Paper text:
A-1(L) is a Myoviridae cyanophage isolated in 1970s9 that specifically infects the model cyanobacterium Anabaena sp. PCC 7120. Using cryo-electron microscopy (cryo-EM), we solved the structure of A-1(L) tail machine, which consists of three parts: a 205-Å-long neck, a 1045-Å-long contractile tail with a complicated baseplate, and six pairs of tail fibers. The dodecameric gp2 portal, the pentadecameric gp5 and the hexameric gp7 sequentially constitute the neck of A-1(L), to which five neck fibers are attached. The long and contractile tail of A-1(L) contains 24 rings of gp10 hexamers that form the tube, surrounded by the sheath of 24 helically stacked gp9 hexamers.
Author numbering:
A (entry chain D), B (entry chain C): 1 to 312, 332 to 395, 404 to 527
C (entry chain B): 341 to 389
């Protein structure tokens, strides 16, 4: 609805009880799964009940996190990315051209529709309830007539925006449909020659209205809220940072009607039985702690000690041990009584290794997968497993290349057009030439009247660009043009043969 | 039937004896199977008869639940999802268009019919007696004439709703058919700028009537009931929370006739011989306790101790041990009498590991399945096993993508239509191109008069979108249109050849 | 008291004998084998392996 009343910080900052209960565990699971440099070793210490801090810091120095949960998330994401997502064009309402233009860039991250959906799936995989919002661009003009309003309505260019889970504050939703939702957004105004400024926005999305309350030039607090705000009247009118007032510091709402007729947000919710991160994160933090303890034990018991029993006065004993040390090598025969090389045998280290291995095995068996594939015709399956991640990175590379080519075309002064279609980086396979040859042959064995010229042109072009590489773009273009002309001639010949 | 009498909280809150006996064990089994962060380590302690709480908390810190029961439930759900569920359209009574419109979204969670049925099956799998209710949307108007009533009757849009088992209070049912059922429903009124309010509803569904008794602005108790209720007259008329009265706090029923002619609920009841969760949950909690004890023992006996026998006065002994510690490395030869590296051998740790392994093996053999698949042509079976969960997540992804595309179409101002059919994410297989080629060839080898053009178009479009990926939607649309035109021409040509 | 305090990787104790006493385990696998043979009989009552 239409809000026009300023609200104090306490009213904006409220969080529903269910979200208050759920956000901490989601943050913990996300921190465990993501790993990386954000991990704090202090939080994952199996310390023997507050021993000396020196040994604690020495143990912390040996922190080597093995994020097997991150590996499992990566594996699931790559496997799901290996699938195919398709849209039937004829079922799209309205003009198809605008749909294609939108599908050129579905979001501000330039990813394609499949890439965006896979990213949403990954975000839900690490922590459920991935939220997406669909919005437009804003255009404002004065002295607006009916034609100007018509143009403004006709110039809408929607795009997607992934709302972080931790930024969600409250939402009313029945089943999967969301009646309304209020979340937070910390937006940083970056100055090229000054300190970064921060603003805090509280966005409430309703059935037919969207509203934002903005606090300007604030300081973010350790709880994710506002700690200090700017006050120009402060400092005898010069302005300074003062503590936030929960009853007197009010933000004026700015609202407008999106005319969507429904809340323009969608929540993807991974099923509880499928959400595995909830059941392995504790195992992952146990792995962190156990690995730290294991490395500390190995370091503190890894050296080899060599003791003696002198052969027959503390000064005399000092003289003896000095001599012994000096003559302790291959080029001397010592005169001692017992000089065993004392060494750790090692049965507890492999015990802890086995414990960590079984924790990793449980992590990888939470999903029905066997880690023995990477523990110790046939290997073609592993090659295809690698090709899956290769295809994912190839899709990302193709998106980046499309953006780069668009910018390059803009550099020449050309206005782009067709967004420069780019293919490839999608079929990683050993011995690919004869696979393309087999594809060509199978296509040609089909009833020629049933094969469009475009498919043959595409397959032949793929073969041409596979057979010759490292060649100038001119050479490939010439070969492709010759192929196109020849295929057109052959298709026309077979068509006229079939006609009579 | 028609109820019009207010009832005290005691009358509403009654629970039948069989439900009173069955709900606790169902809750225990569900908690054991789901696992996750909801697990409380205190409940799964094999404590040595009340030892010091410090060691108890130290042991609790090493709680790493391995929910093998959750893995088994996930495996069964995925395997069942791998099947095919089909509806014969011609057998549907009434108009088919309304059936298709309903099947676009069978419930508020946007899942399809197969997805909803699989979710019901999963809920029954973790705990039997999954209850589903079929309801409509509510529309109320004044000064209603006969035409208005006709429109209200004709504007019914049914959907499904899964009633939680723990919310069931009493039901009269013969066999599988349910004569009537009274359950509870805690509905939270969320305020975007205020504390969440709670209401408690008791819903009685009868043969031809449905009734609800509602208590407003209540506090949920630890037993799932009502503890405190709001009272506006309290606080000298300002209102406050007061304890619930079991004889004087009465809720006014609101009832209406659904005219279904029978109770609009269905109970899915997994057969006792098939319900395995009843026979492994104790093993799962035993696994929890044993794993906690095993990790505690390993941590307390995992370090390596190194003792000496000094070579020849407590102060002198202190001086000696200080010196020894300083010179205990690779760059020194110590002068001691005995310096063994004492270490745990480890036979009890592997004993407990074997015990936990045999418990897990029993859990996985409760269903006729072998866990050795993930313990240590041929591997294609394991790849297909992975593809099963891939297909499940793909179905979920396709549902989410359909919802997102519907919202996007609404953003353009289009009124949707056909719900934007989306396919894919259903065939995960190594080397997929030649499989589609084989499908195309086998289709074309069939009697051409018996193959509709739509099937050929679909298969060729699948091949086209598989051969080229990462390309602009425009390119795929152009290729598909060319394929459609060519296939139409070929079909017409073969038809006219067959005619004469 | 002193011994307990200095019983870790970061200390060299001055004792005379500090073995880590642990159960070897031969009876546990014996009972496991007995239960396994009972299960094998249960599954061989029907002609199944």
């Amino acid at each position: 609805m239409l809000y026009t009343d300023s609200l104090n910080y306490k009213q904006l900052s409220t969080v529903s009880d269910d979200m208050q209960s759920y956000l901490p565990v989601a943050k913990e699971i996300a921190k465990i799964a993501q790993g990386g440099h954000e991990l704090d070793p202090e939080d994952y210490l199996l310390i023997r009940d507050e021993e000396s801090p020196g040994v604690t810091k020495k143990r912390i120095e040996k922190f080597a996190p093995e994020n097997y949960l991150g590996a499992a998330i990566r594996l699931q994401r790559v496997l799901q990315k290996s699938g195919v997502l398709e849209i039937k064009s004829d079922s799209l309402p309205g003009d198809l051209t605008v749909w294609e233009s939108f599908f050129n860039k579905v979001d501000k991250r330039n990813s394609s529709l499949k890439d965006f959906v896979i990213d949403v799936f990954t975000e839900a995989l690490v922590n459920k309830y991935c939220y997406v919002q669909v919005e437009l661009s804003k255009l404002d003009f004065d002295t607006v007539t009916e034609a100007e309003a018509e143009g403004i309505l006709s110039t809408r260019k929607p795009y997607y925006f992934k709302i972080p889970l931790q930024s969600i504050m409250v939402e009313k939703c029945d089943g999967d449909t969301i009646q309304w939702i209020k979340y937070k957004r910390l937006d940083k105004i970056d100055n090229p020659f000054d300190k970064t400024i921060y603003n805090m926005s509280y966005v409430l999305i309703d059935d037919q209205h969207i509203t934002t309350w903005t606090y300007y030039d604030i300081i973010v607090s350790d709880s994710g809220g506002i700690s200090k705000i700017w006050d120009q009247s402060l400092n005898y009118g010069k302005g300074a940072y003062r503590s936030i007032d929960k009853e007197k510091d009010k933000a004026d709402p700015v609202s407008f009607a999106h005319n969507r007729g429904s809340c323009p947000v969608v929540r993807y919710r991974m099923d509880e039985s499928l959400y595995m991160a909830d059941q392995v994160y504790l195992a992952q933090r146990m792995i962190y702690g156990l690995s730290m303890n294991l490395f500390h034990t190995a370091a503190n018991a890894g050296f080899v000690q060599k003791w003696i029993r002198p052969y027959i006065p503390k000064e005399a004993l000092n003289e003896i041990i000095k001599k012994y040390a000096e003559s302790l090598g291959d080029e001397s025969v010592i005169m001692a009584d017992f000089f065993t090389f004392e060494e750790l045998a090692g049965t507890s280290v492999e015990m802890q290794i086995g414990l960590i291995e079984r924790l990793r095995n449980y992590i990888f068996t939470a999903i029905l997968f066997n880690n023995a594939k990477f523990e110790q015709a046939a290997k073609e399956i592993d090659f295809y497993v690698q090709n899956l991640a290769l295809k994912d990175h190839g899709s990302g590379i193709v998106e980046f290349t499309r953006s780069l080519l668009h910018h390059t075309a803009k550099a020449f002064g050309y206005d782009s057009g067709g967004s420069i279609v780019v293919s490839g980086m999608d079929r990683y396979d050993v011995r690919p030439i004869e696979q393309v040859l087999s594809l060509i042959e199978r296509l040609f064995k089909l009833p020629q009247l049933a094969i469009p010229k475009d498919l043959l042109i595409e397959s032949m072009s793929q073969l041409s660009r596979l057979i010759i590489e490292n060649t100038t773009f001119e050479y490939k273009n010439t070969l492709n043009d010759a192929i196109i002309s020849n295929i057109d001639e052959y298709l026309n010949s077979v068509k006229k043969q079939s006609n009579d």
